[PDB]
Write an enzyme that holds these catalytic residues in place. Structure first.
Site, mmCIF file in Angstrom:
data_model
loop_
_atom_site.group_PDB
_atom_site.id
_atom_site.type_symbol
_atom_site.label_atom_id
_atom_site.label_comp_id
_atom_site.label_asym_id
_atom_site.label_seq_id
_atom_site.Cartn_x
_atom_site.Cartn_y
_atom_site.Cartn_z
ATOM 1 N N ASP A 5 25.624 41.392 39.130
ATOM 2 C CA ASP A 5 26.408 41.836 37.985
ATOM 3 C C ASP A 5 25.876 43.143 37.410
ATOM 4 O O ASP A 5 26.659 44.030 37.073
ATOM 5 C CB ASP A 5 26.398 40.749 36.914
ATOM 6 C CG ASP A 5 27.765 40.465 36.360
ATOM 7 O OD1 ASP A 5 28.437 41.417 35.915
ATOM 8 O OD2 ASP A 5 28.158 39.279 36.362
ATOM 9 N N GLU B 11 51.916 56.514 33.349
ATOM 10 C CA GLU B 11 50.561 56.594 33.870
ATOM 11 C C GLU B 11 50.449 55.975 35.264
ATOM 12 O O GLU B 11 51.370 55.321 35.771
ATOM 13 C CB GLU B 11 49.579 55.934 32.908
ATOM 14 C CG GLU B 11 48.956 56.901 31.916
ATOM 15 C CD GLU B 11 48.577 58.231 32.551
ATOM 16 O OE1 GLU B 11 47.615 58.258 33.346
ATOM 17 O OE2 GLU B 11 49.237 59.251 32.257
ATOM 18 N N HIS C 273 36.141 27.481 35.609
ATOM 19 C CA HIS C 273 34.974 26.599 35.566
ATOM 20 C C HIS C 273 35.319 25.115 35.592
ATOM 21 O O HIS C 273 34.391 24.298 35.650
ATOM 22 C CB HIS C 273 34.142 26.882 34.313
ATOM 23 C CG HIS C 273 33.380 28.169 34.364
ATOM 24 N ND1 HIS C 273 33.252 28.915 35.514
ATOM 25 C CD2 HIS C 273 32.715 28.846 33.398
ATOM 26 C CE1 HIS C 273 32.534 29.994 35.256
ATOM 27 N NE2 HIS C 273 32.196 29.976 33.980
#
Ligand code: HEC
Ligand code: HEM
Ligand code: HEM
Lengths: 380, 81, 99, 51, 141, 59, 66, 71, 240, 55
Positions: free
Chosen positions: A228, A271, A201
């Site tokens: 969103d 994983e 920002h």
């Protein structure tokens, strides 16, 4: 008499970051993944809140507490499998976010990218460090293999691995250490994401086209909060398809035995977000070279601010840099498959050639690709 | 000049009750707002059903487990004494 | 053959379909932003119109039809006599800093 | 890099050699004092005996 | 050794070893494109040596792409269906080769006609190898 | 006037009545979705769940 | 005293691939009977015969097999 | 991207926009959508497609070659 | 013998995406598990509480619990005394130690049966085919004393007997007790013991799938309704 | 809040989870405590608007 969203200071920073932030209008569905990582981190935090309320951390009854969560706790199976497949959702959203970052010219947001790779190191550390915590055979031997590959360094290696173990092997102090670390680390990941949003920002967002988007600006509300919500609903569709229909498909089935140090699994495998890391570590025959290739493999996409030799920002107007980017993500998929495969002739030569080609794409061939873009478009 | 500019045709984009320029508005604006607000209400009732479901799953997770509810229930009086 | 390969590269780059010429897709560095301050006003105005129309087209995920694509022979290199001046002035500034 | 290589930057680097080298010895001596290396602290005669 | 290389297509059944199979039909498409571009050069002469070498390179590249897409989609259909004795597995590959032909010559009607004709040609090729009576017979009556 | 026009003219104009209809639709929709999805789940699983065997094999 | 599910025997007497696996398995049986003190065995061919047998009695014989 | 008023200095550009409530929510969703998806996939399928078939060829090569080598 | 055989995709009653288990076959699998497999194998994380709501009534689960004399502690004089089991206690371990289990089974540990189907790759098709795969070993393959050959165990040497055949139990539910039926019943019972949340899991998946099917085009239409200003935004450029 | 008929194992692990997570809520509330402080300024023992004498 006065506006509350520009008068009240918490509402002032909420309005500046969320409501009428100047954002470019042309961003695709791939720009939704940062807020998807925010809400996925929040759902990982809230499922870990409702998961650690019945979790006992010691090696006599960690797996018994996990099975007590999955059977005797009402709706505890949904929380545990939602947390594991939400870690998988978190890492596929993180991988698509970093693929967007490698694609759409956002290397140049430099402090944003550097605190991003610090965040990515912390996310990978808390993912492994929470994957130990069910205390299965695969989790214990994955903890032993991943921490034992940190012992390749001379003169600090065995001090570091008894420091990170609390003993000669993984034990009760190691599991309570990893549970305390797995509590503390996603909150500093969330604070790092807050200051990552602050470093974003400072200079706004960017477009897919690599241009200055200051001429065409829309407010973030209600144009991007409904995108969103649509991204949140499709992410919750894939996440709830993962928990309620295929719960152990992305997970490993070998984790669901009680942990035993007296035997070994027939192939040791971490994983699916650590599979390319394990393939890069398995590619180098020297073990110190493997852990240096691990650290350089995670850190080498932070050198992409310093590997921007082209005068065009994004890869939207770069056609064979697009070819090298899709062969990079092809090398990442081949690395994931090779790390899923065990250590046999000839998976090792495929992993060696694919890791050498992946480092040649991320280091050598894409800056000279940007050079030949600006040579073929007559910049110099 | 300054009135050279005209707004072009939106006839490939306009909704089916506001195509005709000979008729006026505020005769189907109630329908064209109520359709999108019915979609708004049914989207919000889907979000509200998910919020009434998932928070209740979490509240029943903070509630007592089956082992504790099986242990604490056995006040069997029998007929021996 | 090199002009045909450059025209095929211009077609495969994609911004000729989208409505931009060569000097709109530059990375806004400090040299390019100095040249942004150093364009004349009409060239600045239709350059930012072309960037706003390109942002509208990539918001809508569509392009113009083929009759109004920016051709390679219709491309003008407007920023290059300003960007070359800015680059050689920055080069003589860094040579004076080295001196 | 190309703008950072020159005679004036080499003279500025020569001017910044001794204080940055002394800061490097500050970091090395502080790392030695923090970690208490057994090879290095056994050469100093004030900590010669057993600590 | 060319015929012994090209007869590695048949003794390996379909559904396995796609890379060697697509190498055989890519080389077959390249050889047929070389002889078709040699006929095109000896029928229509180019204005330049650069134009003639671009013509033989373009025709060889397009026919090798036709053969490569035909064998790749044939083996991909063999993977997704697991039927090695199926003429539809060659029908899909022949239609994809005709679609590659029409995409390279940039006409969708020619793509559809090439799909139909190359699909029935590949279906007749696989079914002629399945029954076994030869295209080029020995004189036996 | 059609049915969303009457719904906007009497029901959707006020935001508190809008939230009232959202919550009243939640109150009806919880029971209606539970009944319909349990009817679908026991329609596709006749003889497999406990409810089709507890009526005859409980003793 | 009831019989077991004999659809394994019905499959292997009805299908050509099962007796092809049976004939190469008994060829390897005669090979390891002729060769004394050998390291090769009949494990991979009995593995392929068991894989074809159990795959067919799973996927095409399902009127009683669950 | 500092604020919403002092960002750009552009000129002589006019933007017409209609309402959300005076227009269709799905304006020609199929007949202008499926050619647009076809045009976008025509633009990018030659760049995103042959690395993934290289991945599938390496995957089938590795599986059938590992099962050949484990005999 | 380092190669392992993948089990075939068996057409189960719960192999489909929306089909739950057969609870009658879960009851049959628990009955023949308590007959033949519970005297050697030890599961721990399931209890007699979990059988009610799935396969048994509360009186049937209490009658199953009271037939086992389990150990609690302590007696009021300061020793160990036996009591009949209730619904609160877990399953009776037939071997009190894993080393005693290995000493009773010649050096082979019977593993934890509560999590076998999630524990092993291939699922309950492996657990069915391991019990139904008791064939004769081929020649050239020699085994140890009291050790039998399976094609589905990795290492090709199970530490088991051939435990199930026809007429294992005089079956109380009226079904014939052949070996494939008994092995199918314990395979779906071990799938239930591995995932007791299977019925509620696919029920909540049905609620989720119908909810996203009735929610996602509405959210997509809301994105298009709030973005159709920008989709209908056409620009112009009129310099003087 | 008990998770059962009395204070027990689930109450202790639940209070462990809450006791771990709640100081980060206190730290974020301290950040917004500083944020609400920094626009209204800081008090002095005299109790005046003291913007003339500021260090
Ligand atoms: C003699 C006691 C005994 C009996 C009876 C018995 N088992 Fe086993 N079982 C064992 C032992 C010991 C092993 C493991 C060692 C070996 O492979 O020989 C084993 C292996 C297994 C495995 C393999 C798990 C793995 O990780 O490979 C399964 C599943 C299993 N048994 C289930 C059953 C079922 C179901 C029954 C009932 C039909 C049964 N067993 C009967 C003792 C027994
Ligand atoms: C996992 C937690 C992360 C969160 C919560 C997060 C959050 C965000 C958010 C909210 C945005 C703005 C997008 C928008 O709101 O429209 C964004 C953009 C960005 N992020 Fe992240 N991010 C995360 C991880 C990362 C990482 C690991 C990197 C470094 C590779 C990174 C680099 C960027 C960059 C460069 C942008 C700007 C370009 C763009 O908008 O896509 N982020 N992030
Ligand atoms: C601060 C918030 C978090 C808390 C309190 C938390 C807590 C826990 C606990 C108690 C467990 C053990 C229970 C189990 O076995 O699943 C666990 C497991 C796990 N967590 Fe987290 N976690 C948090 C955030 C995350 C995040 C952000 C990730 C993703 C990077 C993550 C990844 C995992 C994984 C992969 C496991 C192992 C899952 C399994 O195998 O069962 N956690 N977490």
């Amino acid at each position: 008499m006065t506006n509350m969203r520009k008068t009240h200071p918490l509402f002032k920073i909420i309005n500046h970051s969320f409501i009428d932030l100047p954002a470019p209008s042309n961003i695709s569905s791939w720009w939704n993944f940062g807020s998807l990582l925010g809400v996925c981190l929040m759902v990982q935090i809230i499922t870990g809140l409702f998961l650690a309320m019945h979790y006992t951390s010691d090696t006599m009854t960690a797996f018994s507490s996990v099975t007590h969560i999955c059977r005797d706790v009402n709706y505890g199976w949904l929380i545990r499998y939602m947390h594991a497949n939400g870690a998988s959702m978190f890492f596929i959203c993180l991988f698509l976010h970093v693929g967007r970052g490698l694609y759409y010219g956002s290397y140049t947001f430099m402090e944003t990218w550097n605190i991003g790779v610090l965040l990515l190191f912390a996310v990978m550390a808390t993912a492994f460090m929470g994957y130990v915590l069910p205390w299965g055979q695969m989790s214990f031997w994955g903890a032993t293999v991943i921490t034992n590959l940190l012992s390749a360094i001379p003169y600090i290696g065995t001090t570091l691995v008894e420091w990170i173990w609390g003993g000669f092997s993984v034990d009760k102090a190691t599991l309570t250490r990893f549970f305390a670390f797995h509590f503390i680390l996603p909150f500093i990941i969330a604070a790092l994401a807050i200051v990552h949003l602050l470093f974003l920002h400072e200079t706004g967002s960017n477009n897919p086209t690599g241009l200055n988007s200051d001429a065409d600006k829309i407010p973030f509300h209600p144009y991007y909060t409904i995108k969103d919500i649509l991204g949140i609903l499709i992410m919750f569709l894939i996440l709830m398809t993962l928990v309620l229909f295929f719960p152990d498909m992305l997970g490993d089935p070998d984790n669901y035995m009680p942990a035993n140090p007296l035997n070994t699994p027939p192939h040791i495998k971490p994983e699916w977000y650590f599979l390319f890391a394990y393939a890069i570590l398995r590619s180098i025959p020297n073990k110190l070279g493997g852990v240096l290739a691990l650290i350089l493999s995670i850190l080498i996409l932070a050198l992409m601010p310093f590997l921007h030799t082209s005068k065009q920002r994004s890869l939207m107007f770069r056609p064979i840099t697009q070819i090298l980017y899709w062969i990079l993500v092809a090398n990442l998929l081949i690395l994931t498959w090779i790390g899923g495969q065990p250590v046999e002739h000839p998976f090792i030569i495929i992993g060696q050639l694919a890791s050498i080609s992946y480092f040649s794409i991320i280091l050598i061939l894409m800056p000279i690709s940007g050079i030949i873009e600006d040579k073929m478009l007559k910049l110099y | 000049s300054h009135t050279d500019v005209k707004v072009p045709d939106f006839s490939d984009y306009r909704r089916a009750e506001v195509l005709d320029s000979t008729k006026s508005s505020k005769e189907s604006s109630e329908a064209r707002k109520g359709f999108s607000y019915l979609v708004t209400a049914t989207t919000t009732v889907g979000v509200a059903y998910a919020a009434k479901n998932v928070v209740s799953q979490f509240v029943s997770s903070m509630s007592a487990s089956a082992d504790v509810l099986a242990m604490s229930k056995i006040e069997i009086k029998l007929s021996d004494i | 053959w090199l002009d045909g390969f450059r025209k095929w590269y211009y077609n495969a780059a994609g911004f000729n379909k989208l409505g931009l010429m060569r000097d709109d897709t530059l990375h806004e560095t400090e040299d390019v932003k100095e040249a942004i301050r150093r364009l004349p006003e009409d060239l600045y105005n239709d350059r930012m119109f072309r960037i706003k129309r390109a942002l509208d087209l990539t918001m809508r995920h569509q392009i113009l039809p083929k009759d109004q694509w920016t051709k390679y022979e219709e491309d003008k290199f407007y920023l290059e006599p300003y960007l070359k001046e800015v680059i050689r002035e920055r080069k003589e500034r860094e040579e004076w800093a080295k001196k | 890099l190309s703008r950072f290589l020159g005679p004036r930057y080499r003279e500025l680097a020569r001017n910044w050699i001794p204080t940055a080298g002394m800061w490097g010895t500050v970091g090395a001596v502080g790392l030695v004092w923090a970690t208490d290396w057994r090879l290095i602290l056994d050469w100093v005669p004030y900590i010669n005996g057993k600590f | 050794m060319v015929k012994r290389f090209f007869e590695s297509y048949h003794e390996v059944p379909d559904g396995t070893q796609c890379h060697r199979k697509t190498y055989i039909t890519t080389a077959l498409g390249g050889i047929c494109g070389i002889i078709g571009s040699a006929y095109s050069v000896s029928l229509n002469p180019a204005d330049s040596t650069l134009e003639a070498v671009a013509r033989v390179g373009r025709y060889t590249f397009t026919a090798a792409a036709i053969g490569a897409m035909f064998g790749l989609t044939t083996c991909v259909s063999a993977q997704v269906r697991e039927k090695p004795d199926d003429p539809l597995n060659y029908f899909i590959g022949g239609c994809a080769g005709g679609l590659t032909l029409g995409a390279r010559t940039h006409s969708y009607g020619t793509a559809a006609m090439g799909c139909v004709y190359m699909g029935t040609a590949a279906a007749l090729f696989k079914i002629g190898k399945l029954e076994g009576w030869e295209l080029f017979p020995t004189p036996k009556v | 006037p059609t049915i969303p026009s009457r719904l906007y003219s009497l029901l959707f104009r006020r935001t508190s009545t809008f939230a009232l209809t959202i919550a009243v639709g939640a109150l009806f929709f919880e029971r209606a979705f539970d009944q319909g999805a349990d009817a679908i789940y026991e329609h596709i699983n006749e003889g497999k769940l406990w409810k089709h065997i507890k009526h005859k094999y409980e003793n | 005293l009831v019989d077991p599910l004999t659809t394994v025997r019905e499959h292997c007497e009805q299908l050509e691939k099962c007796v092809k696996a049976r004939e190469r398995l008994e060829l390897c049986d005669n090979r390891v009977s002729s060769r004394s003190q050998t390291e090769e065995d009949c494990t991979e061919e009995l593995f392929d015969f068991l894989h074809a047998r159990d795959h067919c009695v799973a996927h095409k014989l399902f009127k009683n097999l669950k | 991207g500092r604020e919403f008023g002092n960002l750009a200095r552009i000129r002589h550009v006019i933007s017409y926009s209609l309402s959300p409530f005076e227009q269709r929510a799905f304006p020609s969703y199929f007949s202008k959508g499926i050619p647009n998806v076809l045009r976008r996939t025509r633009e990018r399928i030659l760049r995103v497609a042959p690395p993934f078939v290289v991945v599938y060829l390496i995957y089938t090569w590795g599986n059938q070659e590992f099962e050949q080598s484990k005999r | 013998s380092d190669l392992e055989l993948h089990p075939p995709s068996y057409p189960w009653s719960h192999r489909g995406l929306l089909s739950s288990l057969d609870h009658t076959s879960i009851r049959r699998g628990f009955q023949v598990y308590k007959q033949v497999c519970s005297s050697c194998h030890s599961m721990d994380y399931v209890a007699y509480r979990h059988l009610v709501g799935v396969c048994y009534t509360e009186e049937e689960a209490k009658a199953l619990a009271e037939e086992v004399e389990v150990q609690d502690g302590p007696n009021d004089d300061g020793e160990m005394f036996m009591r009949p089991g209730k619904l609160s206690d877990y399953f009776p371990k037939p071997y009190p130690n894993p080393e005693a289990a290995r000493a009773a089974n010649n050096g082979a540990l019977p593993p934890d049966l509560s999590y076998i189907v999630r524990a092993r790759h291939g699922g309950e098709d492996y657990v069915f085919s391991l019990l139904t795969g008791y064939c004769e070993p081929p020649t050239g393959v020699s085994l140890r004393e009291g050790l039998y050959f399976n094609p589905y165990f990795p290492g090709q040497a199970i530490g088991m007997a051939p435990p199930i055949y026809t007429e294992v139990l005089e079956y109380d539910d009226g079904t014939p007790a052949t070996m494939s039926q008994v092995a199918k019943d314990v395979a779906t019972f071990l799938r239930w013991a591995s995932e007791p949340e299977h019925d509620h899991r696919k029920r909540m998946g049905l609620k989720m799938l119908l909810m996203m099917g009735l929610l996602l085009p509405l959210t997509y239409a809301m994105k298009r309704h709030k973005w159709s200003v920008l989709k209908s935004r056409k620009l112009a450029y009129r310099p003087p």
